[PDB]
Amino acid sequence: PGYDEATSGYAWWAGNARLITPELTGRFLGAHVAHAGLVALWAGGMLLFEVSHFNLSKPMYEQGCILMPHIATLGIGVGQSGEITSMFPFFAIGVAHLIGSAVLGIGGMYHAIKGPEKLYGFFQFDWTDRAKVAQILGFHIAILGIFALLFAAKAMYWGGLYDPWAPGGGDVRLVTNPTLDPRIIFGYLIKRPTGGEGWIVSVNNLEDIIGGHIWIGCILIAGGIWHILVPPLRWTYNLFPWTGETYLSQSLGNVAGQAFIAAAFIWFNNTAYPSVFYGPTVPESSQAQSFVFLMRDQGMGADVASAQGPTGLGKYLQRSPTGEIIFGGETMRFWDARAPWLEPLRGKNGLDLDKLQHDVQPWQLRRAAEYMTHSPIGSLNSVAGLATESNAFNYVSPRTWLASAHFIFGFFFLVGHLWHAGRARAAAAGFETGLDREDEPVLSMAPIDPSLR
Amino acid sequence: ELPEAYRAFGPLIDVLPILPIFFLLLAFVWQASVGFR
Amino acid sequence: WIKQLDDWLKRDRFVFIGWSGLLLFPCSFLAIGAWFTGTTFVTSWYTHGLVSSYLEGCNFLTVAVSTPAESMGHSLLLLWGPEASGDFVRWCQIGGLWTFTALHGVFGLIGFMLRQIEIARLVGIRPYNAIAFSAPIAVYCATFLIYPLGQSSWFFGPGFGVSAIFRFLLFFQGFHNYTLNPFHMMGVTGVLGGALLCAIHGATVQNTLFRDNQSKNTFKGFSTDQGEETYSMVTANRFWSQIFGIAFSNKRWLHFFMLFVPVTGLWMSAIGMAGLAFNLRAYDFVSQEIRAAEDPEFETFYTKNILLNEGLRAWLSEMDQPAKKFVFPDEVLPRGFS
Amino acid sequence: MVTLKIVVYLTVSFFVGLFIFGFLSGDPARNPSG
């Protein structure tokens, strides 16, 4: 068969490339179902690991958890101000994942050890059979859309999501009125990716989040039905080779960009990633420092707005390049941060002095007292306090870990996409194994030097 | 901490996250067993 | 009689000995060995006021065979010498293992260059590898020998450990402003270009290969015995001419360039260290130290490097050299107004 | 600077349109083999 190097062309270290060939489709399916099982295996076991070492005293983000916050964001297990009501829902999801891993592992072992080596009936696909591969694409788009709509329905009907912007603190609440405006939802796509706008990372309420999910669920149902019913058109014939490595390369490039986007979401956004669960963003932690050094100087009689720094700028409060009242110091770079413990200090011009001096509603100090001294700063062996500081504190933020890991994943997958894009083009062309000695293309080209005729 | 009713696994729950990091190792193990044929 | 031993040493075994192996294997085995003895067991408490062994509690990053005590001067610190009087422990507490390791290492490096020459002579190839190895020896002699000889003692040499080298790097910036040293800038250029050349030549060869096999694994498209080029130099010249504007056309010149670039970079950095032995430093630009002092508004990145150097100097030196007993009160230490 | 913003918008538009429509000109057929 095609399981060694000699009858496949692929060495041991490039051996899953032996599943490229379209007669080995049962093994392609087996490798995939077993990999999906491994993904669910980690999803179960790592969550159970987080639960088994969870101390209820420390909130959630000091524990070094990354799957606990994802569940808590969905309004499961937690209630008011993100307090863990019960440790049983996290355990239930951690075991439901294990059972799914078991079932998917059995399927992956079946189609790789015992099931039919070549698929048939309505499951036989060839990579060059473009109507069939688009039809499989369409089923995947339709199933993805019905998951996105089901998530939106759950956010709207059953239970709810954690709203960090809910009145006071932020409780779980079900989104009754999602933003169905095409002007608003697709206006996120035209916002500049730069500071101030933050292209889609600045989605900052649950109506916009769930309305965009309703839209994309419908859009994906539509595109899935389109690909089941309409084969690839004539204009998409010579755009790129229709091989399997091409399809992989395109997936790789899109998901590399998607990992970069998720790194931005975990690092800047505090709506879909509530800081009760993931800890404060660096912008929000750095405004929390200024807010607590502000409230120190209230009470000991230091009028803030007439206070100069080393440079004549505002010692605690100054004006933006736009001219809005922002926190002074180096934290003037994060004047675009919008944390919900600070929005009731926001007026018309930014931080007005009216509901700043005889404001802060007690918890708003406490919360910002918490986020001041839990900043995303740390090391590989888990320590905090700048970097040139004494090691006593054993802590590195979840947001640091997730953003670092997904920039890493985005970078390797952009590299892997470039690898498979070049290789797919070269393999379809017929020169991915080297130059033909019999005829070399540069030998049949005219010279580039202008003097040479 | 995990629920007391199912607080018998102990080190099992420690093992399960690094269970998938052993599958990539056992891939190299199987390839050595066949001899990287 | 004497010819028999020559015929012995030139034999074909698992490890070639040669005549150079008398000046290489007894020294290198000692130098390498004295590092492992040092970084496992001996302390720098009496030379440096720090812990630098696995027995202390350090790890691989923070173990060292630290430099001798600053009061030892430029003494060789022989075991039978007056500073140890034959006593092994008193020789290890004063940093005699650093001098053992450094002297056995420079002799090992001489022995290895002699080995490269001897094996080239035996096989019959040109001795270009020994020429290229003259650049690590120029750097070793500049950093570990010429620099501490020009300084006060062996103490200011680089310690034989990872973090000791990191201290050496930051010491050289703060006290020497070594990034500003142009010979070091050519060293950096040579080393970065050597890495660029290594990467670009490997990838160019790998992507201009000929179809000399049938399998997708192109690593089996080359035999040792074949006398033909495995990659198209013509296609590579075409590609780099139309990408970069220039390309190599001469394979021999290409591989001489790959020799020439990191070796000359490394030699130029050794010249810079030879200058830093006598404190002859590219520390400052006199025009800008002047202008920034007649104008309290003239800020360049250079003036912010000079300030950072002063900050490093005052905030390191009281525990860097503890023989000097530098006492700096907290209010003469340059802070940047925390 | 509104006119300069327009010039930049059109210049970026023109160059990216050249890129995009040039990669819908049957670019994989621009190989030496075929």
Added chain:
Amino acid sequence: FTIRWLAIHALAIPSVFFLGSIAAMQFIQR
């Protein structure tokens, strides 16, 4: 007692000793 028996032991008769020492250092209470 040959050349093969010395160039594999002068590097390794000490090395196992060193490794045993360093493995004992993981159990030192300081």
Added chain:
Amino acid sequence: SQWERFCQWITSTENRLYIGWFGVLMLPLLGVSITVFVTAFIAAPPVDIDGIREPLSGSLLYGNNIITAAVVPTSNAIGLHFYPIWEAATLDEWLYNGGPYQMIAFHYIPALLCYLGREWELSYRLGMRPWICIAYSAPVAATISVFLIYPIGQGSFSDGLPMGISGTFNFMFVFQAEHNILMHPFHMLGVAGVLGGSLFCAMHGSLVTSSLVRETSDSQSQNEGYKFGQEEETYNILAAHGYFGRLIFQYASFNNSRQLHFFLAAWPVVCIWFVALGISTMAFNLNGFNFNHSVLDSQGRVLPSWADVVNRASLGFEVMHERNAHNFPLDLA
């Protein structure tokens, strides 16, 4: 068709410099980058780098040096805001706030992405294997980590790499003070990669040079023994192999050359990937190893180690950078 003539001319392998569709994007991006950089490196006025009305004089006509000139990074007052030529009031606050840096950077980063794509383009038009762009992706990752990813992670384009020699040195020192990159394992890999790539470059060059086939006389260059396009191998792989094997041991010297040049590609490329990634995770403040206060005596006193001495020098750098700009004791990102 005029358009088909255009697509033939762009994708033409007849041009002295290949253009292609990545090059039709690359050439204007370089035009802007080169124009604004040569303009700003010579004649830009001082830039308010840290947003505190302390202009930093970075250009060659403002009393400044080739070593010490820099296109100074964009003001900390701007942060990550899009600040083009037209969103500023005038052409003098834009110069004052560091707009030239952002313009050069925002054309330089896509120009390098397009140069990588152009390398793939020409590999495809010449029928050679397509992965020189993969090798080039390592310095590109490195230069995007210090021009885009670290400013994004830290929150301002003032934390970007200054476009100058001494500005680069300043970036290195401040980065060590704030992140301890020397004790970052990705940076130890990057150092191993650059120093070992130099080792392997010198090593491979000396071996191929040392085992050259005699074709020439002694009073002419050995490079005349090679003829461009000759099919015969110009050196002896067997002789260089035998020398290297006698130098260390038997199963050490690459017999194969395709594997050998894959290793020459792979070692510095992979290590520069890792060190670009290290800059990028320190962009999210995931700093290097920390061994301060790690070796304690019987009572509990900290015995200094060499990492403590490196900390003490990093603290030296730490309390002097951006002096008139930290109003609180905690310099966050």
Added chain:
Amino acid sequence: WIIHSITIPALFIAGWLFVSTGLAYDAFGTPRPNEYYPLPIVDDRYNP
């Protein structure tokens, strides 16, 4: 696995017991965990 059955053990245990019995601290003059602060940089050459 015959002539080295105990040879590898005896040597490994020798290194282990060299550290564990405290002979290493006396062998190299290494300060024990409480000899650090009962700090002595040696200030003279011929008599440390």
Added chain:
Amino acid sequence: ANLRTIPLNEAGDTVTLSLEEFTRGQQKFNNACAICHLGGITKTNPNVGLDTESLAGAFPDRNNLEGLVDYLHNPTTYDGLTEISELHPSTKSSDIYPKMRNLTEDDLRAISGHILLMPKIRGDQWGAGKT
């Protein structure tokens, strides 16, 4: 030895601490208090350090083990005007700060005894840091 012996109260009675008890208190210093008291000072306010000269000069004198435990029972100012148990973690106020909800009287005693049985070990290495 004598490092274990610390001031207990303001009456004057040097109470000795077990080494294991001191270590147990030291650990709990680095889990609920090193968030912002790591090193010897307070991150929220860089003037109220956990040093001997500061705690003896506190009003009331809080350089005592019972004094520190009673502080943890009631957060006040450095002169003791307003008992602001809300800006600070507090043994009574577990709702604002859940870090000491599991800490017993022995835990408070040990963490308060470890703060006052470093300063003659370190000196100028805990007070405000080694510069």
